[PDB]
């Protein structure tokens, strides 16, 4: 997260870290056994780490659970990043409580101008590389469709939206992929891609989760 602030421990209890001997993507706990992340984060041997704040120190509220299954959307396209969503089943259910909790799926898509919270352990520098220890948060508006398509001509599908600032200076960055964009207590987006991080007129692009609510429900129902 570039231009964000330290969230505070336990303040984003649905945020997970995907770990393979290092943090490589975030995700969101949507119920005690399932996490939503980005399809481009897929890899074998994922350990899901719940209740984290400092990802380098065991501080107390952590739960490390191996992924049992990673269901990448069958129409994910790695070139266009269309349908960039993956469900992860946990080997074992999480212990839900204060410090660890699920986030609700939306029943409706969000309007332009809605304020959202984006969080993650990604890079905090636009030109450089500085990875935080602790979770970083950032408030950002969903931008209009026309501004999103003007920023990325030919590249925005129905399953995407842009959020952030056209002035630059505040954005999600590498390491934040697969994490949550929460608006009004509902998961509306998944961190997916962009041209760099926090660049002028190149806002972050996000997977539009309201287009996937039936897919998520039916898949979870089947596995």
């Amino acid at each position: 997260i570039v231009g964000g602030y330290t969230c505070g421990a336990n303040t984003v209890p649905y945020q997970v870290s995907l770990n393979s001997g290092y943090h490589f993507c975030g995700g969101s706990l949507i119920n005690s056994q399932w996490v939503v992340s980005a399809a481009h984060c897929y890899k074998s041997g994922i350990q899901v780490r719940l209740g984290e704040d400092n990802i380098n120190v065991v501080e107390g509220n952590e739960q490390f659970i191996s992924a049992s299954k990673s269901i990448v959307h069958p129409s994910y396209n790695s070139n266009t990043l269309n349908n960039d969503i993956m469900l992860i089943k946990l080997k074992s259910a999480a212990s839900l409580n204060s410090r660890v909790a699920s986030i609700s799926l939306p029943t409706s898509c969000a309007s332009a101008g809605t304020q959202c919270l984006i969080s993650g352990w990604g890079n905090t520098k636009s030109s450089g590389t500085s990875y935080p220890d602790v979770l970083k948060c950032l408030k950002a508006p969903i931008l209009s469709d026309s501004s999103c398509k003007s920023a990325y001509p030919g590249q925005i599908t129905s399953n995407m939206f842009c959020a952030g600032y056209l002035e630059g200076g505040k954005d999600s960055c590498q390491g934040d992929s697969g994490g949550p964009v929460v608006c009004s207590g509902k998961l509306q987006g998944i961190v997916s891609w962009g041209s760099g991080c926090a660049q002028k007129n190149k806002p972050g692009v996000y997977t539009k989760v309201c287009n996937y609510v039936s897919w998520i429900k039916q898949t979870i129902a089947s596995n």
């Binding site: 490589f24 993507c25 481009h40 590498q174 390491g175 961190v191 962009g194 760099g196 972050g204």
Partner: peptide, 9 residues
């Protein structure tokens, strides 16, 4: 680029 570590550009 995707925002994964490492990025996929």
């Amino acid at each position: 680029c995707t925002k994964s570590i490492p990025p996929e550009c």
